[PDB]
């Protein structure tokens, strides 16, 4: 196995100088060996990416999937330790920087078939990972405007050179 | 093509549909507030409304008695329908049942649920959706418009 995610919480940075931007706090949390498919868990983990802590919890509370309840519990555990252990002043001042699903250690069983034949069943397990960063969620991406697109086209033209000559 | 058909397909078939709704109706009459799936509660609401109409017809009506006998499997409820529920709803012309949606069932099937009740029952009041007060900003502006329009002809 490998369990690096837990140790990411033990990094100690040196004291910051007075004339330096305040470093945002970072919290890493995971749940190992969830009886759930990592593929099915991906959709839940994907959905809350980039959302704030309260926004993510609202979306999870009204979802009908099993993993939705599991991810909610991990987020609450992560939220509490951030205030309790990582000197996060405000509970609400958190957003989901990273959230992903990983394969776990599964089991092999037999699924019976009609004619004295069988197949290899897999009892799937998964991991869930999150990193929470203090501060408001980063602003959403803005689509490129028509003028923005046109300028890139002109830059593409201006980069041209005479090819295969002095 | 199921255009114009006013019934859901429930249970094991047409007879099974009636018996399933019949049991829900019998529970509603006894308890006056029932939890069921939204689709089934919606299907049973129509029979809940019409049953009260038959009770209004009167005890001496033979058609009402036969209909009440069929639908109420527990026969102690027949006096209740004619002597309790029907007297309660004498004033109303309709809309005896109040049906609302409650959170999804937390039982791994995540069914859509509803609470169906007869109006005027003795149970604790349901937490109904309550509209905003006239004191809110939008309502006051609308209230201001109403006063001017009526007063100025």
């Amino acid at each position: 196995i490998s369990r690096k995610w837990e140790k990411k919480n033990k990094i100690v940075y040196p004291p910051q100088l007075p004339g330096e931007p305040r470093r945002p706090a970072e919290i890493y949390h995971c749940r190992r060996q969830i009886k759930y498919s990592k593929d099915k868990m991906w959709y839940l983990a994907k959905m809350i990416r980039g959302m704030s802590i309260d926004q993510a919890l609202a979306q999870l509370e009204f979802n009908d999937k099993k993993g939705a309840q599991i991810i909610k519990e991990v987020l609450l555990e992560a939220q509490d330790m951030a205030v309790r252990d990582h000197n996060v002043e405000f509970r609400s001042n958190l957003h989901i920087a990273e959230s992903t699903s990983g394969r776990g250690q599964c089991l092999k069983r037999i699924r019976y078939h009609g004619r004295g034949r069988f197949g290899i069943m897999e009892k799937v397990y998964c991991h869930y990972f999150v990193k929470l960063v203090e501060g408001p969620p980063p602003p959403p991406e803005v689509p490129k405007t028509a003028v923005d697109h046109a300028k890139d086209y002109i830059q593409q033209l201006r980069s041209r050179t005479i090819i295969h000559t002095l | 093509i199921s255009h114009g058909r006013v019934y859901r397909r429930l249970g094991l078939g047409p007879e099974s549909r009636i018996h399933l709704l019949r049991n829900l109706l019998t529970g509603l009459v006894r308890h006056e507030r029932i939890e069921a799936t939204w689709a089934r509660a919606d299907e049973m609401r129509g029979y809940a409304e019409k049953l009260i109409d038959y009770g209004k017809l009167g005890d001496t009506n033979e058609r009402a008695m036969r209909m009440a006998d069929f639908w109420l499997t527990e026969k102690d409820l027949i006096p209740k329908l004619f002597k309790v529920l029907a007297p309660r709803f004498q004033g109303q012309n309709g809309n005896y049942t109040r049906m609302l949606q409650i959170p999804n069932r937390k039982e791994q099937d995540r069914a859509k649920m509803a609470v169906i009740e007869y109006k005027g029952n003795y149970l604790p009041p349901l937490p109904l959706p309550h509209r905003d007060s006239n004191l809110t900003l939008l309502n006051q502006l609308l209230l201001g418009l109403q006063q001017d329009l009526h007063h100025n002809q």
Partner: protein, 238 residues
């Protein structure tokens, strides 16, 4: 064909907790060894007004010699060199040096400068933190204030009035409790101890006594929320 289902057996506790088990208590064949004793034999009550004094106390101890000096005799009986005249200075050396370890986090040295009742009360709440403690001049000289003795332990409470600086930080270097560099004057009572019997026993810092009449300490910079009672639907607030 197939492979067999081996059940494939900080883990034994869960194993036996789920299964349940009769854990009969066991008599330890070797007695556990204690080099210090939790608590203070007699908690010295600091006289009111002992602070804000800008030797009289030492005279009071001379009066309490009836219940204290006899203990000193025992301290001499096992060492014969413990003199309260010179001890004050040595006490400061431990205190100052011990606190300095925290800056480096040389937990190795601390174990040789503090007892097993002070190390857990000096480092436990500093893991994943970077303290910065510096000693400014001492306002007045240290003085012994209370000597007690009980296998056989002796405790010599010392009174110190000094000026210090503390600048604890988080994992991320952010300031959490204190001013980067500003002296503040502190009057704290320290309780040293020693294991008289052991040939390799010396004087180490055991605990500190906090007078009730002490001023409140500086508060943390951050703002806290104290949650109110959490109520299930049955319950109602009161």
């Amino acid at each position: 064909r197939f492979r067999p289902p081996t059940p494939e057996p900080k883990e034994f506790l869960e194993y036996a907790r789920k299964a349940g088990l009769v854990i009969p208590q066991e008599r330890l064949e070797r007695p556990i060894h204690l080099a210090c004793t939790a608590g203070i034999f007699d908690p010295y009550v600091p006289p009111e007004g002992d602070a804000r004094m800008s030797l009289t106390q030492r005279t009071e101890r001379l009066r309490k010699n009836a219940a204290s000096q006899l203990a000193i005799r025992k301290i001499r009986e096992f060492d014969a060199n413990f003199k309260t005249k010179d001890f004050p200075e040595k006490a400061k050396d431990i205190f100052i040096e011990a606190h300095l370890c925290l800056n480096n986090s040389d937990h190795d040295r601390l174990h040789t400068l503090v007892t097993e009742h002070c190390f857990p009360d000096m480092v436990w709440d500093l893991k994943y933190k970077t303290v910065r403690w510096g000693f400014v001049e001492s306002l007045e000289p240290a003085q012994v204030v209370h000597v007690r003795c009980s296998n056989m332990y002796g405790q010599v409470t010392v009174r110190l009035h000094t000026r210090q600086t503390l600048a604890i930080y988080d994992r991320f270097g952010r300031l959490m409790y204190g001013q980067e560099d500003v002296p503040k004057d502190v009057l704290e009572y320290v309780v040293f101890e020693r294991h008289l019997m052991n040939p390799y026993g010396s004087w180490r810092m055991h605990a500190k006594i906090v007078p009730a009449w002490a001023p409140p300490k500086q508060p943390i910079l951050k703002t806290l929320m104290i949650p109110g009672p959490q109520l299930k639907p049955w319950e109602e607030y009161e």
